[PDB]
């Protein structure tokens, strides 16, 4: 209930760092973003034993609810990290982007990249022949401040790109088609 | 005020086309340029007043397709053609077609090019011009007195070689007649015992064969001027990397003797353009004719700087038939110039390996003193598989050799190239190398100085401490900037009050304890017990960061960084990967399990269902990283598959016209 009451009021972030089974999996699903640690965390309502007993399927915990499964197949997790330390560092970095509540504007921090910087490399990025693809991530990197881009679901549904970046120090959300 | 061709067509791509166009605009000549399909937006096409496509991307179908160029010349009413270097500079047939259409060719006559083209005649012409002899002996050496006769005809030093065998068995250098008699006797006995063949050959030998070449300028009137020599000894894979003028080895007497003999040869063959007479020079300053280049060379700018002369302008004036305005006595050596050709190659693989990609950012260091850059690329340029990897010629000029070498090192540290791998690290290390600085150089310099391979700069204890301090200061600066939010009335921010940052920094499998504090823009860093001070503006967005460590000025680049702690730093031209953690984070990291990390990129598989349009590789072929292996079509998008890494094709599992599926093996790389 509290999760649902807090949705859209204050950001909520979940980091799955170990086993997580049963109804406990639903609270992270209600939060805004879910991150997973590789090889040591998993999410599933029912464990492999019940799956084998009921549907006669053989699967391991990693296959059933591993970080790779939920970051590449189910679209449940947003990012997978190598370690607890790496995950926590990236979590701090990510938290830097968000506002504290819906009553506050988008965070604006000190910026060194000039807002009028030209990007001549984009003048020929798009091939003339519509049968050749390019990488939209290159355009995104060129346009944003310091070429820094925090991508969301980088390995899931790769035909679209979503993420966080900064323009003139102000947090922005990037959505783009991926012709590649 | 000097009449010249009204319009000129430059049949070349890359830096040379841009270089010629700049001169034509300077002289008021209108310009036309030829481009393949892929080079449509290249700087030369943009620079040219008019441009014409001459064909498909492969060079054979474009630059070497004379018919397409000829139609273009007719279409543009082009008065004259400048061929630059490579491609059709030396092709006789093109000159004939130009002559048929009454188009002036800016260069020498076909006979002069052909005469030098033949090795056998070129020597007879060199002997007749009385230039240092380079004799070739087709017959066998019968005895030790015939060996001495032949050695005197060739000139000392000579190399005695066995006709059979390999690996340098039965080879001897002889410096005089007595060493020839023993060298022949010993080599014949060694060859008879090792190979059952006593037949010997005698060729000239060159101690430390420094490659020294004299530029020459010729006119229809028959007047000729010698330009000062150029040292091009530093070379990789038979391709020159660093060139300098004048040579640090030649005195005023030898240099003049070389210049006079090069002009004697040029007059003997009635040369009518800028050219180069190449020599091998031994440790005793004996010089021997190698070949006479009959085209403007790539290393022409270093000569232009010391002489003060524009070779392209002179080539155009001679083509109009205007007489030369200079006499040998007017040609001085002013200062010192060094050129370092820049390539898109991995210096670490072999000495150079071709690399391909889009230049996502490119910034030349022109602002720095005594720097001239000859390039044919811009930001967004695509270094393609079809052509030479040369990014630019980087040239530095000084009042003396030291000043030129210092400005170069500074220029290489200030050169920004992003999106391809490049040889700047190798160039920068050659320029500062104690042998190169002393002028102890030969054509073997790169193999002698780096026998195992290029491993990048090697840091001295002080350099390592400076690099660690700079990295720690950069890390702390990023962390500090992370805390500078704008005012939030609802929730004021509370500054994290930290006086000292304790960091574990991993450089090369070694972990260093660092304690960093700051005051204003000054960072005090204790590295393993050594105190350093780092000062800078700490602009974290600019590609180049200038810092002062204990008063020593450094220019560093931050190529990439991650929240985890990884950081790539270009320092002294080399890219070092460091990993920075806080002390507590480093301590807690000890409980993390090392992962398998097994992910082979050798196998290349199909990402999505489709039809294989074409396959660009076959077993045994060499593929550079990022090089296309095959193209897959789906929903008419011509998807391209790229090689994971540089290597060869162990096996090709796909064929054109075959409907592949996702997760299907396409090719294997070693």
Residue extents of the structural domains in chain B: 1-133, 134-205, 206-443, 444-592, 593-670
B236 is in an annotated binding site: no
What single DSSP character describes residue B487? Answer: P
Residue A141 in 3-state DSSP?
helix
What is the distance between the alpha carbons of residues A157 and A159, in angstroms, rounded to a whole number?
A: 6
* Closest C-alpha among B260, B289, B269 to residue B277: B289
C-alpha separations of B526 from A157, B229, B466, B548 in Å: 47, 51, 11, 16
Which of B53, B361, B379 should we substitute to test contact with A (largest number of A Cβ atoms within 10 Å)?
B379
Note whether B21 and B34 are within 8 A (CB): no
Partners of A20 in beta bridges: A43
Residue of A nearest to B564 (CA): A86
3-state helix, strand, coil in chain B (%, to 5): 30, 30, 40
Tell me which DSSP letter residue B527 carries: E
Distance, CA of B389 to CA of B354 (rounded, Å): 7
- C-alpha pair distances (Å), B303 with each of A75, B217, B537: 64, 12, 39
CA distance B212 to B250: 9
Beta strands in B90-209 (DSSP E): 104-105, 158-162, 171-174, 200-204
Residue B209 labelled as part of a binding site: yes
The residue to which tokens 């984070």 are assigned = B585
Name, in order, each residue with C-beta under 8 angstroms of B25's C-beta and a sequence gap of 6 or more.
B31
Which of A103, A104, A112 should one mutate to test binding to chain B, selecting the residue with the greatest count of B CBs within 10 A?
A112
Report the alpha-carbon distance of residue B105 to residue B93 in Å, rounded. 12
A100–B contact, CB cutoff 8 A:
yes
List the single residue in A with minimal CA-CA distance to B480.
A110
Angle at the Cα of B368 from the Cα atoms of B382 and B335, rounded to 5 degrees: 110
In chain A, residues with a C-beta closer than 8 Å to the C-beta of B359 are: 121
Out of B291, B463, B526, B628, the active site residue is B291
Asked if residue B287 belongs to a known ligand binding site, the reply is no
Nearest Cα of chain A lies from the Cα of B667 at a distance, in angstroms, of 20
3-state secondary structure of B668: strand
Residue B193 marked as a ligand binder? yes
Question: Do β-strands B603-606 and B664-669 pair in parallel, antiparallel, or remain unpaired?
Answer: antiparallel
A104 vs B contacts (CB less than 8 Å): 488, 490-491
Residue B291 a catalytic site member: yes
Angstrom distances, CA of residue B130 to CA of B125, B153, B213: 8, 13, 17
Q: Is the dihedral of CA B161, B162, B168, B172 positive or negative?
A: negative
Rounded CA separation B204/B438 (Å): 27
Q: Do A104 and B41 touch (CB under 8 A)?
A: no
Determine contact: A18 vs chain B, CB below 8 A: no
Shortest CA distance to B123 belongs to which of B154, B90, B163? B154
Among A104, A111, A132, select the one facing B490 at the smallest CB separation.
A104
| B200 neighbors B140 (Cβ within 8 angstroms) | yes
Question: Do A85 and B41 count as a contact with CB atoms less than 8 A apart?
Answer: no
The beta-carbon neighbor of A123 closest among B361, B380, B589 is B380
Mutate to test the interface with B, among A17, A83, A157, A180 (most CBs of B within 10 A): A83
> How many pairs of residues across A and B have Cβ atoms under 8 Å apart?
86
Chain B interface includes A120 (CB < 8 A): yes
> What is the sign, positive or negative, of the torsion defined by CA atoms of B120, B122, B125, B131?
negative
Do residues B69 and B11 lie in contact, with contact meaning Cβ atoms separated by under 8 Å? yes
Which residues fall within 8 angstroms of residue A144, CB to CB, at 6 or more apart? A165, A166, A167, A172, A174
Query: Is position B177 annotated in a ligand binding site?
Result: yes
Pure H helices in B521-593: 583-589
Of residues B258, B292, B256, the one with CA closest to residue B275: B292
d(CA B557, CA B543): 6
Interface contact A68, partner B, CB < 8 A: no
């Amino acid at each position: 209930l509290r999760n649902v009451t807090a949705s859209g009021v204050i950001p909520q972030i979940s980091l799955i760092m170990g086993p997580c089974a049963g109804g406990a999996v639903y609270s992270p699903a209600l939060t805004d973003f879910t991150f997973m640690v590789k090889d040591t965390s998993y999410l599933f309502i029912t464990g492999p034993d019940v799956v084998k007993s009921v549907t006669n399927e053989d699967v391991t915990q990693e296959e059933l609810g591993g970080a790779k499964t939920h970051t590449t197949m189910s679209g449940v997790a947003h990012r997978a990290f190598e370690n607890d330390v790496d995950a926590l560092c990236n979590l701090r970095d990510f938290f830097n982007y968000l506002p504290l509540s819906s009553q506050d504007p988008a965070p604006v921090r000190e910026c060194h990249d000039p807002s009028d910087r030209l990007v001549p490399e984009l003048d020929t990025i798009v091939p003339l022949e519509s049968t050749k693809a390019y990488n939209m991530v290159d355009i995104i990197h060129s346009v944003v401040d310091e070429r820094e881009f925090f991508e969301i679901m980088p390995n899931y549904a790769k035909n679209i790109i979503v993420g966080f970046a900064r323009m003139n120090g102000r947090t922005v959300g990037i959505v783009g088609n991926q012709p590649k | 005020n000097e009449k010249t061709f009204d319009k000129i067509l430059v049949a070349n791509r890359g830096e040379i086309a841009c270089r010629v166009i700049r001169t034509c605009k300077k002289m008021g000549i209108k310009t036309v340029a030829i481009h393949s399909d892929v080079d449509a937006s290249s700087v030369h096409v943009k620079m040219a007043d008019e441009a014409v496509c001459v064909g498909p991307a492969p060079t054979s179908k474009s630059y070497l397709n004379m018919d397409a160029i000829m139609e273009a010349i007719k279409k543009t009413r082009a008065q004259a053609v400048h061929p630059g270097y490579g491609f059709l500079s030396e092709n006789k047939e093109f000159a004939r077609c130009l002559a048929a259409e009454d188009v002036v060719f800016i260069g020498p006559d076909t006979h002069a090019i052909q005469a030098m083209g033949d090795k056998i005649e070129s020597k007879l012409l060199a002997k007749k011009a009385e230039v240092n002899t380079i004799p070739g002996f087709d017959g066998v050496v019968k005895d030790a007195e015939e060996a001495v006769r032949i050695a005197r005809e060739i000139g000392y030093p000579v190399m005695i070689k066995a006709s059979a065998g390999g690996g340098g068995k039965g080879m001897r250098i002889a410096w005089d007649d007595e060493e020839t008699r023993d060298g022949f006797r010993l080599s014949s006995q060694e060859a008879a015992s090792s190979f059952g063949d006593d037949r010997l050959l005698i060729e000239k030998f060159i101690d430390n064969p420094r490659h020294i070449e004299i530029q020459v300028l010729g006119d229809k009137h028959g007047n000729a001027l010698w330009l000062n020599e150029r040292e091009c000894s530093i070379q990789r894979r038979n391709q020159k990397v660093v060139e300098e003028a004048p040579s640090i080895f030649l005195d005023a007497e030898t240099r003049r003797a070389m210049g006079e003999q090069a002009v004697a040869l040029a007059r003997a063959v009635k040369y009518s353009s800028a050219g180069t007479v190449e020599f091998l020079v031994d440790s005793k300053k004996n010089f021997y004719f190698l070949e006479m280049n009959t085209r403007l060379q790539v290393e022409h700018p270093v000569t232009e700087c010391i002489t003060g002369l524009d070779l392209v302008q002179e080539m155009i004036r001679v083509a109009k038939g205007y007489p030369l305005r200079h006499k040998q006595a007017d040609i001085r050596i002013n200062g010192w110039a060094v050129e370092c050709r820049v390539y898109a190659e991995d210096p670490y693989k072999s000495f150079g390996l071709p690399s391909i990609g889009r230049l996502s950012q490119y910034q030349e260091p022109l602002h720095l003193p005594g720097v001239r850059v000859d390039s044919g690329i811009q930001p967004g340029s695509d270094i393609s598989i079809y052509y030479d990897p040369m990014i630019s010629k980087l040239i530095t000029y000084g009042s003396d050799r030291t000043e030129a070498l210092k400005r170069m090192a500074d220029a290489l540290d200030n050169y920004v190239i992003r999106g391809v791998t490049h040889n700047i690290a190798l160039l920068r290390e050659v320029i500062i190398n104690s042998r190169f600085v002393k002028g102890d150089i030969s054509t073997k310099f790169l193999s002698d100085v780096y026998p195992d391979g290029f491993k990048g700069h090697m840091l001295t204890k002080s350099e390592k401490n400076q690099l660690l301090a700079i990295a720690s200061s950069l890390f702390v600066a990023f962390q500090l900037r992370a805390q500078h939010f704008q005012e939030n009335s609802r929730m004021p921010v509370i500054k994290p009050d930290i006086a000292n940052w304790e960091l574990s920094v991993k450089l090369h499998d070694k972990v260093h304890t660092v304690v960093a504090s700051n005051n204003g823009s000054v960072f005090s860093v204790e590295v393993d017990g050594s105190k350093l001070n780092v000062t800078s503006t700490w602009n974290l967005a600019s590609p180049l960061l200038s810092v002062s460590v204990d008063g020593t000025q450094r220019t560093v680049q931050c190529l990439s960084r991650e929240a985890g702690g990884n950081m790539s730093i270009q320092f002294l031209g080399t890219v070092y990967k460091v990993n920075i953690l806080t002390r507590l984070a480093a301590e807690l990291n000890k409980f993390m399990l090392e992962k398998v990390t097994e992910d082979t990129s050798s196998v290349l598989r199909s990402p999505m269902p489709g039809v294989v349009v074409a396959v660009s590789v076959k077993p045994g072929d060499a593929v550079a990283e990022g090089q296309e292996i095959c193209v897959i079509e789906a929903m008419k998008m011509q998807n391209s598959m790229t090689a994971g890494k540089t290597g060869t094709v162990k096996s090709v599992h796909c064929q054109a016209g075959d409907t592949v599926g996702e997760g299907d093996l396409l090719v294997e790389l070693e």
